[PDB]
A paper describes a structure:
A stabilized and solubilized Env trimer (SOSIP; gp120-gp41 disulfide [SOS] with an isoleucine-to-proline mutation [IP] in gp41) derived from a subtype B Env gene, named B41, has been described previously and has a partially overlapping glycan hole with that of BG505. Like BG505, B41 SOSIP lacks glycans at positions 289 and 230 but does contain the more highly conserved glycan at 241. In this study, we isolated B41-specific monoclonal Abs (mAbs) and confirmed that the dominant B41 autologous neutralizing response targets the 230/289 glycan hole on the B41 immunogen. Antibodies elicited against stabilized HIV Env immunogen trimers can exhibit robust neutralization against immunogen-matched neutralization-resistant (tier 2) viruses in animal models.
To characterize the binding mode of the B41-specific antibodies, we have obtained an ∼3.9-Å resolution cryoEM map reconstruction of nAb 13B in complex with the B41 SOSIP trimers and built an atomic model. 13B binds to the glycan hole epitope with the heavy chain making the majority of contacts. The glycan hole epitope is surrounded by 8 glycans, including N88, N234, N241, N276, N295, N339, N355, and N448, which likely constrain the angle of approach for the elicited antibodies. Representative 2D classes showed that all nAbs bind with a stoichiometry of three antibodies per trimer. Thus, we concluded that protein sequence differences between BG505 and B41 within the epitope region are responsible for the lack of cross-reactivity. Using the cryoEM structure of the B41 SOSIP trimer in complex with nAb 13B, we determined that B41- and BG505-specific nAbs target amino acids that differ between the strains.
Numbering used by the authors:
A (entry chain L): 1 to 27, 27A, 28 to 95, 95A, 95B, 95C, 95D, 96 to 107
B (entry chain D), C (entry chain B), D (entry chain I): 525 to 543, 564 to 664
E (entry chain A): 31 to 56, 63 to 138, 148, 148A, 148B, 148C, 148D, 149 to 184, ...
F (entry chain G): 195 to 246
G (entry chain H): 4 to 82, 82A, 82B, 83 to 100, 100A, 100B, 100C, 100D, ...
Write the structure that this text describes.
Amino acid sequence: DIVMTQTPASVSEPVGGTVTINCQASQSRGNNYLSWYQQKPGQSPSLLIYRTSTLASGVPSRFKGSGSGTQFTLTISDLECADAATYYCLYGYYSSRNPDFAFGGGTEVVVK
Amino acid sequence: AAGSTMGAASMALTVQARLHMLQLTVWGIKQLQARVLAVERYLRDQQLLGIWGCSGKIICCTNVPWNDSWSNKTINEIWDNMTWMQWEKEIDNYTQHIYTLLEVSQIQQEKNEQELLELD
Amino acid sequence: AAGSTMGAASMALTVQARLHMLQLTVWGIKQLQARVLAVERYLRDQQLLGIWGCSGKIICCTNVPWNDSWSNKTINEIWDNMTWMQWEKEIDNYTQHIYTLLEVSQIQQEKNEQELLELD
Amino acid sequence: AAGSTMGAASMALTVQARLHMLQLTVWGIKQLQARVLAVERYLRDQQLLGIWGCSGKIICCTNVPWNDSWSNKTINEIWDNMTWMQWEKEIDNYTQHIYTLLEVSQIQQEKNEQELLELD
Amino acid sequence: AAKKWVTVYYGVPVWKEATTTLFCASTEVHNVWATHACVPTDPNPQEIVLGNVTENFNMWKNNMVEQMHEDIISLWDQSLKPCVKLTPLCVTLNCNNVNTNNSDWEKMETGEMKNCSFNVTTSIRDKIKKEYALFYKLDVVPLTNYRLINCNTSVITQACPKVSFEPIPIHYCAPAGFAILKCNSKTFNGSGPCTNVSTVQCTHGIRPVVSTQLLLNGSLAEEEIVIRSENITDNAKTIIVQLNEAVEINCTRPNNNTRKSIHIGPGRAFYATGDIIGNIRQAHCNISKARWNETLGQIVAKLEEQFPNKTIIFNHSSGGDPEIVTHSFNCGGEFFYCNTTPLFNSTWNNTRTDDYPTGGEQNITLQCRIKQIINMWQGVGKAMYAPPIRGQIRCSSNITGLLLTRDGGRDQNGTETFRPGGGNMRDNWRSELYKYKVVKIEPLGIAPTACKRR
Amino acid sequence: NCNTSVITQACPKVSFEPIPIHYCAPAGFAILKCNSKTFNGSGPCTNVSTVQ
Amino acid sequence: LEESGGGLVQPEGSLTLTCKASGFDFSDYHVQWVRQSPGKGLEFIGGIAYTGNIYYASWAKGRFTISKTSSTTVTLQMTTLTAADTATYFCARAYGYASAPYAQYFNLWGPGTLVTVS
Ligand SMILES: *[C@@H]1O[C@H](CO)[C@@H](O[C@@H]2O[C@H](CO)[C@@H](O[C@@H]3O[C@H](CO)[C@@H](O)[C@H](O[C@H]4O[C@H](CO)[C@@H](O)[C@H](O)[C@@H]4O)[C@@H]3O)[C@H](O)[C@H]2NC(C)=O)[C@H](O)[C@H]1NC(C)=O
Ligand SMILES: *[C@@H]1O[C@H](CO)[C@@H](O[C@@H]2O[C@H](CO)[C@@H](O[C@@H]3O[C@H](CO)[C@@H](O)[C@H](O)[C@@H]3O)[C@H](O)[C@H]2NC(C)=O)[C@H](O)[C@H]1NC(C)=O
Ligand SMILES: *[C@@H]1O[C@H](CO)[C@@H](O[C@@H]2O[C@H](CO)[C@@H](O)[C@H](O)[C@H]2NC(C)=O)[C@H](O)[C@H]1NC(C)=O
Ligand SMILES: *[C@@H]1O[C@H](CO)[C@@H](O[C@@H]2O[C@H](CO)[C@@H](O)[C@H](O)[C@H]2NC(C)=O)[C@H](O)[C@H]1NC(C)=O
Ligand SMILES: *[C@@H]1O[C@H](CO)[C@@H](O[C@@H]2O[C@H](CO)[C@@H](O)[C@H](O)[C@H]2NC(C)=O)[C@H](O)[C@H]1NC(C)=O
Ligand SMILES: *[C@@H]1O[C@H](CO)[C@@H](O[C@@H]2O[C@H](CO)[C@@H](O)[C@H](O)[C@H]2NC(C)=O)[C@H](O)[C@H]1NC(C)=O
Ligand SMILES: *[C@@H]1O[C@H](CO)[C@@H](O[C@@H]2O[C@H](CO)[C@@H](O)[C@H](O)[C@H]2NC(C)=O)[C@H](O)[C@H]1NC(C)=O
Ligand SMILES: *[C@@H]1O[C@H](CO)[C@@H](O[C@@H]2O[C@H](CO)[C@@H](O)[C@H](O)[C@H]2NC(C)=O)[C@H](O)[C@H]1NC(C)=O
Ligand SMILES: *[C@@H]1O[C@H](CO)[C@@H](O[C@@H]2O[C@H](CO)[C@@H](O)[C@H](O)[C@H]2NC(C)=O)[C@H](O)[C@H]1NC(C)=O
Ligand SMILES: *[C@@H]1O[C@H](CO)[C@@H](O[C@@H]2O[C@H](CO)[C@@H](O)[C@H](O)[C@H]2NC(C)=O)[C@H](O)[C@H]1NC(C)=O
Ligand SMILES: *[C@@H]1O[C@H](CO)[C@@H](O[C@@H]2O[C@H](CO)[C@@H](O)[C@H](O)[C@H]2NC(C)=O)[C@H](O)[C@H]1NC(C)=O
Ligand SMILES: *[C@@H]1O[C@H](CO)[C@@H](O[C@@H]2O[C@H](CO)[C@@H](O)[C@H](O)[C@H]2NC(C)=O)[C@H](O)[C@H]1NC(C)=O
Ligand SMILES: *[C@@H]1O[C@H](CO)[C@@H](O[C@@H]2O[C@H](CO)[C@@H](O)[C@H](O)[C@H]2NC(C)=O)[C@H](O)[C@H]1NC(C)=O
Ligand SMILES: *[C@@H]1O[C@H](CO)[C@@H](O[C@@H]2O[C@H](CO)[C@@H](O)[C@H](O)[C@H]2NC(C)=O)[C@H](O)[C@H]1NC(C)=O
Ligand SMILES: *[C@@H]1O[C@H](CO)[C@@H](O)[C@H](O)[C@H]1NC(C)=O
Ligand SMILES: *[C@@H]1O[C@H](CO)[C@@H](O)[C@H](O)[C@H]1NC(C)=O
Ligand SMILES: *[C@@H]1O[C@H](CO)[C@@H](O)[C@H](O)[C@H]1NC(C)=O
Ligand SMILES: *[C@@H]1O[C@H](CO)[C@@H](O)[C@H](O)[C@H]1NC(C)=O
Ligand SMILES: *[C@@H]1O[C@H](CO)[C@@H](O)[C@H](O)[C@H]1NC(C)=O
Ligand SMILES: *[C@@H]1O[C@H](CO)[C@@H](O)[C@H](O)[C@H]1NC(C)=O
Ligand SMILES: *[C@@H]1O[C@H](CO)[C@@H](O)[C@H](O)[C@H]1NC(C)=O
Ligand SMILES: *[C@@H]1O[C@H](CO)[C@@H](O)[C@H](O)[C@H]1NC(C)=O
Ligand SMILES: *[C@@H]1O[C@H](CO)[C@@H](O)[C@H](O)[C@H]1NC(C)=O
Ligand SMILES: *[C@@H]1O[C@H](CO)[C@@H](O)[C@H](O)[C@H]1NC(C)=O
Ligand SMILES: *[C@@H]1O[C@H](CO)[C@@H](O)[C@H](O)[C@H]1NC(C)=O
Ligand SMILES: *[C@@H]1O[C@H](CO)[C@@H](O)[C@H](O)[C@H]1NC(C)=O
Ligand SMILES: *[C@@H]1O[C@H](CO)[C@@H](O)[C@H](O)[C@H]1NC(C)=O
Ligand SMILES: *[C@@H]1O[C@H](CO)[C@@H](O)[C@H](O)[C@H]1NC(C)=O
Ligand SMILES: *[C@@H]1O[C@H](CO)[C@@H](O)[C@H](O)[C@H]1NC(C)=O
């Protein structure tokens, strides 16, 4: 399997600042197999990023994704309190033999 | 019996109703002309019927009297006891007079009078 | 809902309604054929509607009964709960029978009976 | 006076109503284009009138109100005391709006409401 | 409670598959593919989305491809018709070599560019003059005496030297009464059922690009690389690989090649290669190594699923005439034939590319040759002579896809071999028109009602 | 002009005599003409008539 | 998309949850199941390919069955449940592609269904 690790956890920054999330995953098969989700407490997660470097429609110019094999980062350019959420990093590879799906544990980001 | 009264010989019927790349070859050019011509002939008749207010008709009734100078024979002498080809020859010289009358006033006035009646 | 009842998928709509010198070049010949063909297809449909007395109609009402051998389903089984493409396939073998009935008597008799009524 | 009211200069009249082998020669190709084009222009007008339910009309009456944003002049300011060419220029920017209104609902609803009324 | 009656509906949304004649839609360069005869396109070609419909598409049975094939041939020809036929040049050529030894590695000429003299009848029929021209090795054959290649058995016509061959997108448009359906499904793969269907009066523009091995300037896959085939198992079919990212290819013909005008008849001017100012060099193309490596890594993952466990082997063409077994493209009238051995250089395990050693090399080079006498479609249409175009020619293009074939598929060692093969140019156009189907509209329909006519 | 061009002999049966040619508009079109004595080839014209 | 069929189940009992394609026909889409227990992130359960191929997570270990039962209807069966399996279960969509590997990013997430064991 693939094991995804996320850090830092329990992130808390002042409103108007910036945040980055560091994600690790072994055996990457490329940067096109990784995505990010934004989950606010009480709801379903929503697609934020769908390719390491590409954001989902409706997503503002923050949450820029970047990375290289096994090394992924999400950057929040503007900590509006509207974005306080738990962010998840997802990896998967549909395959007839090796689906390889994994999520990290999520990173809580608090905007004060 | 509208199609049977005007002579027994009404059997031409409607063969005209029965009726790949456009390569400009010896036969191909002729095929093109045939298609273009079929359209032109169809429209000339349809346009004239449209002008007279007979566009949707097989037989259209009008408000223009027979006149009787064209032919002074009666209904049972013209409509019956006669073949359509003979008839068209008998009144051939009045074709334009009649067509003019079928449009002038008959469609033009009829429609302008309706325009006035429809204002009420 | 006449255009919505016969399946949700009625969205082909009317792309057919949406639709320099005639040089006979490689592309030019094809352009000519496209124009000639568009005219021919338009007229074939318009002429048939004209024959049935449906020339000015979107939907025309007739005096010919459904028969029910073509399809014995009811209005809420055919008109509703069905897509137009499925329907045309279901009664495809009756196309000529129905077209014949739409003209024969339905336009021909209707007009001859009117000719007689209009003599009064 | 429908053709006389809209300016004295209504004298263009209907020259458009007044209007051998297809050899593809220098003059012959041009003759072909002229015939094909005459058909296309005729049909574009006839089809539009057909859509509005004005196929057999010279003047057709509709159920769509004048709106008055297009022009707020009255009948004796527009219909009379004006030439048709001036008029077409005055409301040129509303051509598509008006054509859309002449079809939408005006023919479409009118026919669907009749379909319902004819079920009784 | 009521009788059913027959009613007629006009504007009924139904259709049937049909094949018809399509017309095209779109500076005094007389472009041959996109002539002034094209109608302009609609600035707002609104697409109509269909509802819950399905349709069956098959790119391998698509008559639009066949119709395009014939149009490209007819446009190539005709455009070249009112030009000089060069028959008078089919005479003995007395040829020798040129001195290429004027450190230009990867750019050196080796025994090509022959200096030929010939006896040609001048514009005056009783006068003969000796003329000189340089020829590419691939344009002549020995009988040292030489003749122009393909003179025997064919007529080589000089393109009129004002006419451009630059591809310009051409849109295909249905005649009114017809429409083109397109499959937008992400799962389509060129065949079978499609649930996301929409329709247009006209297709998107397609550049009438002619090439071999690599498909240039076509569309990219929307998101992920798609491998299409009529049949995966059948090694005789072409496998079309559509990339979701382009790979840049940059080609140069770095010579100051100045042309010469020779009168061989009454208004019939032959445009000769003239001579070279400066140091003569061979043509070449460069691609980015990193991009090629990423592209092939993704392609092997996809081919490996189709052919699991087995070793992926890429190889060079099988060998044969360097007209059809090499890469081919056209930049401004210069026809390039390039050696792609370095692109299909090797084999590897898993989906991990290998045998491309890490080093300072950034640009993979392909050595190229130039031909003036060419044969698009081999035996269909006429041979054409490409005038020289005054030197320093540079161009670049987007590799959008590859044409691969399987090398027999009889290797008993647990391997599969792919080569940059392919068939007729139909394969190139098929790869772009794959999503379209032509249907006819039949707006008059019949249904039961409860109304009755008075 | 032999050099640079092809000189073609007219077929010796063909006449070049000018014969009046009328230009005709396709139906749906018309040709307007200015009959003003003051026209001079340009600008406004008040005496206007039309022909096919 | 919406899920259904949650509620309380006893120890070692079972549930079947149903995800409905309310205007989102699963014809070219993959349907996947995930789980999120209280205070946790997301675990992956498995899913159905547009092709009909059914795959499972190492998280399920055979305790879950994934099946397309009709067009528009996908269900998740779960058995021999314990306290640790209390979670909100969700269905989500991913695009299918005409290919071999697929990115499978999620979209069209449903609201989720609570399953509790006690
Ligand atoms: C893939 O697409 C690319 C572009 O996206 C395309 O490359 C382009 O090719 C055209 C070929 O015509 C180049 O245009 C030439 O540019 C040079 C620049 O100096 C001009 O001198 C050329 O002029 C010729 O045409 C003139 C017309 O009057 C003549 O007067 C003159 O004497 C020349 O004959 C011409 O404009 C264009 O610049 C490139 N684009 C780039 C960015 O380089 C490529 O060819 C396509 N791929 C394939 C396989 O076709
Ligand atoms: C296409 O690819 C070839 C092959 O790489 C390119 O030629 C290479 O160009 C580089 C850059 O000039 C040369 O590297 C260095 O150049 C400097 C210039 O002063 C020199 O001082 C260094 O010692 C070194 O040579 C490289 O050597 C050269 N390769 C060869 C075989 O000569 C070419 O430029 C590329 N360009 C295009 C347009 O396709
Ligand atoms: C090809 O051959 C011709 C003649 O054999 C070369 O042209 C000669 O160039 C020299 C240079 O000084 C002149 O002095 C001669 O008078 C030229 N001869 C003629 C007939 O013009 C031409 O340069 C050769 N090309 C190459 C590449 O070697
Ligand atoms: C072009 O014509 C010349 C003569 O006008 C040819 O040169 C002669 O070739 C014959 C062949 O035996 C020799 O015997 C003569 O001595 C040559 N004359 C000269 C002046 O050299 C020449 O070979 C022809 N070239 C080609 C390519 O046909
Ligand atoms: C189903 O079809 C619709 C229409 O073909 C697709 O809608 C497109 O969605 C993309 C998303 O950015 C837009 O950019 C396009 O402009 C839309 N098309 C049109 C005509 O507006 C939809 O994406 C298709 N669904 C799938 C799964 O392919
Ligand atoms: C391209 O798509 C077609 C259509 O989905 C694939 O053909 C199917 O292949 C499966 C393999 O078991 C068959 O069970 C289906 O019945 C086939 N469908 C039809 C309509 O025949 C084809 O294999 C796909 N190509 C690739 C490379 O996957
Ligand atoms: C080859 O690919 C490049 C990008 O990889 C294309 O460049 C883009 O072209 C579009 C055209 O509108 C521009 O809007 C983008 O901004 C360009 N990208 C960049 C990075 O500048 C190029 O046009 C492609 N060539 C062909 C023939 O498709
Ligand atoms: C795709 O190509 C393969 C290869 O030819 C076809 O499979 C062969 O079918 C014939 C039928 O007689 C068998 O004798 C061969 O043994 C089969 N080959 C293999 C490797 O099994 C296959 O049927 C083609 N697919 C389609 C849809 O036509
Ligand atoms: C082909 O040429 C293009 C430009 O002519 C090269 O693209 C440039 O690449 C550099 C690399 O840093 C960029 O900084 C430039 O901005 C790019 N230019 C443009 C216009 O995008 C391209 O890399 C060359 N490709 C090859 C294989 O040589
Ligand atoms: C790439 O293709 C070449 C050409 O077919 C292969 O080389 C041949 O290998 C066979 C193996 O027995 C020899 O018998 C032939 O004589 C070789 N041909 C030549 C021209 O030497 C080569 O092995 C292929 N590449 C791979 C990885 O298999
Ligand atoms: C393409 O280039 C390769 C070299 O890059 C040519 O193959 C070489 O041919 C020479 C001839 O002696 C051999 O000594 C080399 O070992 C060969 N190298 C390789 C990699 O095989 C090849 O023939 C050229 N092909 C074409 C079509 O021009
Ligand atoms: C194809 O394989 C050959 C080796 O089999 C590669 O040749 C090497 O290329 C590097 C590039 O600088 C040189 O430094 C080595 O010295 C070359 N090795 C030999 C034996 O000559 C060749 O580059 C490969 N093609 C590609 C595109 O990588
Ligand atoms: C104004 O126009 C009318 C019509 O164009 C002109 O009438 C012409 O008058 C001459 C006088 O002999 C007649 O021979 C022509 O036959 C008339 N034309 C027509 C069509 O019948 C009138 O002359 C023009 N007025 C001016 C001042 O030019
Ligand atoms: C031909 O007629 C035109 C139109 O009447 C004349 O142009 C006018 O010239 C006067 C000279 O002052 C200007 O004031 C007008 O404004 C011009 N009219 C237009 C419409 O521009 C033209 O000069 C006449 N030619 C001759 C030789 O008199
Ligand atoms: C027929 O119409 C013409 C029109 O001038 C009229 O003069 C003639 O007297 C009419 N004939 C009869 C018999 O009334
Ligand atoms: C019609 O009038 C002519 C005038 O001579 C006459 O000879 C002819 O017999 C008349 N026909 C009828 C049917 O009265
Ligand atoms: C038809 O006209 C002729 C004229 O001689 C007459 O003899 C014959 O009886 C007429 N026929 C009928 C059916 O009136
Ligand atoms: C007028 O009509 C009669 C009908 O028989 C015909 O014989 C005569 O030749 C016609 N005259 C002209 C000038 O057409
Ligand atoms: C339909 O019309 C045909 C015409 O022959 C008739 O035989 C048939 O019985 C009719 N069908 C029904 C169900 O009445
Ligand atoms: C129509 O008649 C056929 C005859 O077998 C019958 O099977 C079918 O169920 C009938 N359909 C309806 C709607 O009654
Ligand atoms: C008759 O109509 C039915 C309707 O489904 C169709 O299935 C059948 O193939 C048709 N038969 C013929 C001969 O057209
Ligand atoms: C004309 O129709 C438009 C349609 O939106 C409407 O907004 C406008 O107010 C109408 N004009 C008048 C004067 O009623
Ligand atoms: C129409 O409305 C405009 C708005 O300014 C006004 O100026 C104009 O005089 C009005 N015309 C009429 C006929 O009322
Ligand atoms: C709108 O109509 C008026 C009427 O005179 C015209 O002057 C104006 O130029 C038109 N505007 C546009 C954009 O067509
Ligand atoms: C597809 O079918 C569903 C069934 O509920 C319907 O709601 C939907 O509107 C249909 N699609 C379209 C485009 O109407
Ligand atoms: C054309 O001439 C070349 C010269 O060698 C020869 O090899 C070739 O076979 C000839 N073509 C034919 C069809 O004989
Ligand atoms: C890949 O490497 C493994 C190492 O054990 C080997 O077993 C396998 O056969 C190799 N596969 C290929 C395609 O060479
Ligand atoms: C190709 O990409 C893979 C990805 O890991 C990399 O490991 C390998 O070194 C790359 N090869 C080249 C030649 O860049
Ligand atoms: C054609 O030949 C004549 C003969 O003197 C010459 O003057 C003229 O310049 C030649 N034409 C050209 C374009 O050289």
